[PDB]
Amino acid sequence: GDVEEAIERAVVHVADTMRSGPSNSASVPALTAVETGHTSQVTPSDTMQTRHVKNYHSRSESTVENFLGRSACVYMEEYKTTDNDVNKKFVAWPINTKQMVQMRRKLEMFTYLRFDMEVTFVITSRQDPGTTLAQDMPVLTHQIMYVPPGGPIPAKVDDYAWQTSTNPSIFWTEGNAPARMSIPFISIGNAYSNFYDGWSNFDQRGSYGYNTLNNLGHIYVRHVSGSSPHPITSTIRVYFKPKHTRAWVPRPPRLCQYKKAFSVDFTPTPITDTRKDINTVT
Amino acid sequence: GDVEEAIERAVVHVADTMRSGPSNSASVPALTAVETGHTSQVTPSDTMQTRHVKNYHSRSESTVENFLGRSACVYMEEYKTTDNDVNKKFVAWPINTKQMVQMRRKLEMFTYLRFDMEVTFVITSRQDPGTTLAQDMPVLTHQIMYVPPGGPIPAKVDDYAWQTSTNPSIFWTEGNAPARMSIPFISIGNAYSNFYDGWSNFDQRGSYGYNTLNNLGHIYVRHVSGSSPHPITSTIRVYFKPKHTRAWVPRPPRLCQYKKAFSVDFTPTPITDTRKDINTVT
Amino acid sequence: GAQVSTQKTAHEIHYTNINYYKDAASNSANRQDFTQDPSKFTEPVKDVMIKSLPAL
Amino acid sequence: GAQVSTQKTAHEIHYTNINYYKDAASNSANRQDFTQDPSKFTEPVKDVMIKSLPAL
Amino acid sequence: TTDQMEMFRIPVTINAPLQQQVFGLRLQPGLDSVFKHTLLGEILNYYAHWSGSMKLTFVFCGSAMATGKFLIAYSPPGANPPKTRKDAMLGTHIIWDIGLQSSCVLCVPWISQTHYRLVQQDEYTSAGYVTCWYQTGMIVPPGTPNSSSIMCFASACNDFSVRMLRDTPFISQDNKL
Amino acid sequence: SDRVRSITLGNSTITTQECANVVVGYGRWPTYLRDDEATAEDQPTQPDVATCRFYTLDSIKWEKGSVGWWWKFPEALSDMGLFGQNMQYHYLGRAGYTIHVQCNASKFHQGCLLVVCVPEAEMGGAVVGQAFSATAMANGDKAYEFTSATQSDQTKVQTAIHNAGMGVGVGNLTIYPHQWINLRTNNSATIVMPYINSVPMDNMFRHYNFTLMVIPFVKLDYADTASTYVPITVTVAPMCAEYNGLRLAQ
Amino acid sequence: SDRVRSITLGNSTITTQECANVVVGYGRWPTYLRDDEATAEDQPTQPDVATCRFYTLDSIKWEKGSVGWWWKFPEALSDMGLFGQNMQYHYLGRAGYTIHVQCNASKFHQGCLLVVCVPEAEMGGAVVGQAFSATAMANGDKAYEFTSATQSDQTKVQTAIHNAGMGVGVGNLTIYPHQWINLRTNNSATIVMPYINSVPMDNMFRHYNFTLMVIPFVKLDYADTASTYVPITVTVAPMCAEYNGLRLAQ
Ligand SMILES: CN1CCN(Cc2ccc(NCc3ccc(F)c(F)c3)cc2)CC1
Ligand SMILES: CN1CCN(Cc2ccc(NCc3ccc(F)c(F)c3)cc2)CC1
Incomplete structure (x- = not known):
């Protein structure tokens, strides 16, 4: 064999x-x-x-596997190595695929999905402008932490929660290849649902729409121990790439521009563009 | 087995x-x-x-596979990390093989070609001259995006279009090996055509020549999030290396110097150099 | 324990794959499946209709 | 699923290759083919001409 | 069109000249405004190349007592689009008779010099025109409306296919949501 | 003897009593399109005989100062019999050709011609970075003149003979299918050109399949005779022509 | 149901959802010329598809006072597509035809038409012993009007309807192949006419093979409706057409 x-x-x-x-x-x-x-x-x-x-x-090339098998940015955020505001030195992002328009529209062509996920992180740094910039700093290191729902959440860069014992985490150093991981199908139901025409409470009250089923957790990022004499700003981009995909119940593609990250709200739009008359072909 | x-x-x-x-x-x-x-x-x-x-x-060593199986520069361009002009902070290049003379002449010895492509990118950076240069900046990161014809085109470095969900892209960090990818045969016809003796409109009007069949798309490059206190200039070089090549209908090599990137225009040239007389052999 | 299969190419060629991780989610994308059936959305009627025969 | 073939060297030697990707475009260059035929461009005439015999 | 829903209705009248044009359009499924946002057009806009045949289905939504005949023709690419029925009838066409069966299908054959065509079509890769003309005219008995409407449906045949995935240009954003 | 050739297409015949062999493209005889290579769906039309016949394309005059001429196909036959009508009425076309170029002179004349068919003979404008209309390079069956000196008018193609209007050495045109008409030992040249293109079929009004060039390498010469010029005639015949995509006449 | 018919010739199709059977000449289907019956020596040309297709021949208006119309073939199709070109360029021709005449009206209309193809429908002048030009009896695809009263102008044919311009009882035309369009139970008539003549082939510019006649036996009638007339359309399609004797265009 x-x-x-x-x-x-x-x-x-x-x-x-x-x-x-x-x-x-x-x-x-x-x-x-x-x-x-x-x-x-x-x-x-x-x-x-x-x-x-x-x-x-x-x-x-038209298979759903290939159609969705492309990495796409889903979120980007900035955090500084040193600053007065504590909340500005780290990121806290609730996971959801509705933030970026293109990937959202691609997914929203199917009602239900079931796939594995491949996540890649791109991190870059730059020195903030200022009057004095002459300094020497070794290479920086970053930590990415994933907190399933209900777990403790850090409140500052040097919080105890950053000592992950069960929460998976990645430590990455600049100059190397981007970090990567694989995530299995982690839905409580039998498939992810892009739409949910229902309420939260049993008396038809409370939250409405797909916001009710979003309980995937959070992601936190920070500089490990970098604390420069002068501020340094870093940016992180998150890329999602579905694998082993299955889809059900196709729906027409969206026509109106998106306006909210957790709602279907829109403004009426013309069906299409116009021309001189029904016979014009030039 | x-x-x-x-x-x-x-x-x-x-x-x-x-x-x-x-x-x-x-x-x-x-x-x-x-x-x-x-x-x-x-x-x-x-x-x-x-x-x-x-x-x-x-x-x-004279096979077409080996003759064309060498990487060659096809385009180079410069873009700055920070500057006043928005158009100067990123590159937008319509793909074509007619820009650089040597590779153009090599290809133009055959009327029709059919091959796979191997693309390699070489990126370098340098600090622009100025009065104050003392600064500290972490390693930079670059993004290369390929936009097939008809797709959205970014208008600024921080445009939404940079969130590729279907457009393939590469994120690269300085200090590592050059980026690389493989591209299959992506012609609508049965073979690439270096020459096209015809017009665009059916009434023999409009664009003329090989410019009509060039619809391969665009390439865009930018600094991910680098924004230095002082300008930093970067250069990108693109290398093409055909693979699995087949060629048809050889034609004589060009003699007159090239003068336009999308035309065959030229100036008359002598057939060859001269000598004292028909009998001189020294 | 290696798998050998053909690779996409008109009418004119093998690659080897091995899995290194113990979780199936780590495998590479299985983008080699091409089976499809559109009758679900194009002919959802109960009684089959012959194209040659009149619709009604 | 490995391929073994000879490598270029007068009259005085094997290498192994394995494909890792599922697309044939990713394979390495197949620069080991040496078949050729110039009669297409040198003898495009309809009636074959014997070199020894007169042309006309 | 003050009312958006009017875009789906093709007017037809009882009394018209003997030969008259009902409608005309360019066959650019991925670029023309007519096919741009249809269920078919949306899929193509995610790709760069396409090939295969197309189906255009027309349904007459007039009265039951109304009757008429229509000529639908597809003209391959050329220097000039047809201007009169005599010109249109030279190319591929079908004579449509309205009766118990209220729908007729015009299959646009795949005639092209290249195996594929660009979604962002240009002069080089044109595809032709489609036009409809009165064959006999619409006749109605007493006590019926003087106008009727027709609707058109677009779909791909079983030999249709696409290639080169590309990001669609219809959707864009300026700021993070 | 192998110096005599006879060709019969349709209802026309060509007989040459003093000629060389017949070059045959890149060793490929013209043929119809195969089922496994076609792309268009509808049935093609194959009006053999009606279209596959010889058509004489006007005549030129060879003087002592002639430099050369060219024709572009299939546009040259745009208004020649039923071939022109079929080309007008159809979106797609496909056909090979048989080119026969006649030129006869006495035993006391001297000269040499080069006959060559150049596929995809793209040409550049007289003034760099300046477009030209579709009239300085093809206007039906009329022949176009090369020029010994460099062209200057901006509305026409660069006619410098030694560059062939293509930016390549004129002496290297031998690579293409060709024949020589040497007045010592020849009177005509025959070339059979198969259909060469990057696609199974193409429109014949928008695309010039190939270009025919006649270039005197050794200028005509004679002495003490009443004949002042040597006429040259060109005859063409489509082979295995088939059309598709019927539409209104262009 | 046998009330629905579909006919497909070349790249054109005709569908009638309410029609009778299809009369077929004298029980003979059109066919090509046999080897043992031909007389011309040279190879014929058989441009099927290009010429064997339906061609709509203009439209007439049926009023309460209409008397009838006639067309003469094959001259009616003299300038209709490649059929006209082939007929112009050839000395001899041969082809059968399929004639389809459409006429639809509501359930509340009444009327009856006679559709008949008369081979060798020779006609007499309006004034005895007076010749007429070839313009009062055929001028392309335009239809010609019968007259209820006796004709008087000497430059045109006798148009008296009851004599059919042939000196025979109009009621006896039933002998020829024919069909009736009765608005109660019919909408179109289909006739397949084989090639009938005393010789294997004949010139199509000099000889009128047969004449098509449409005669309202029961005049149109209606009451209290917005429709003022009932259009009538005629469609023809040559079958198994073959030409011979190529010559310069007439
Ligand atoms: C309501 N559903 C939620 C899921 N959404 C698709 C989706 C599913 C999972 C993810 N990410 C899962 C994940 C993957 C890797 C991680 F490290 C992590 F914290 C979370 C992103 C989008 C469709 C709408
Ligand atoms: C008119 N043809 C166009 C193609 N040209 C050769 C050619 C073909 C493809 C390419 N590049 C293809 C490509 C390869 C990789 C990419 F990322 C990308 F965007 C595009 C370059 C030159 C010959 C003349």
């Missing part, structure tokens, strides 16, 4: 075109009735003479 | 030379007629006595 040799998936090419000749009969493929809610299955071979053509095109 | 053992390609050596002696006959290999457009196939053995020689030379 040194080699398994997985059988070929057998490239699935699109349907070919069969030769067709003149016809005169009672069959009427062209005529149908959309009232049934059934999309017609006619082909060009059924309405005009056609030659035989072998199609080698494939629909590989 | 732990080893496949690919059969040897069998080194193809050049033709040998066969021994030949004195001859006196009606056969006249030397005499031919170029009017037929047929190149003579005579060999030295057909016109003078020759010894038997075994040639071990091979034409391995």
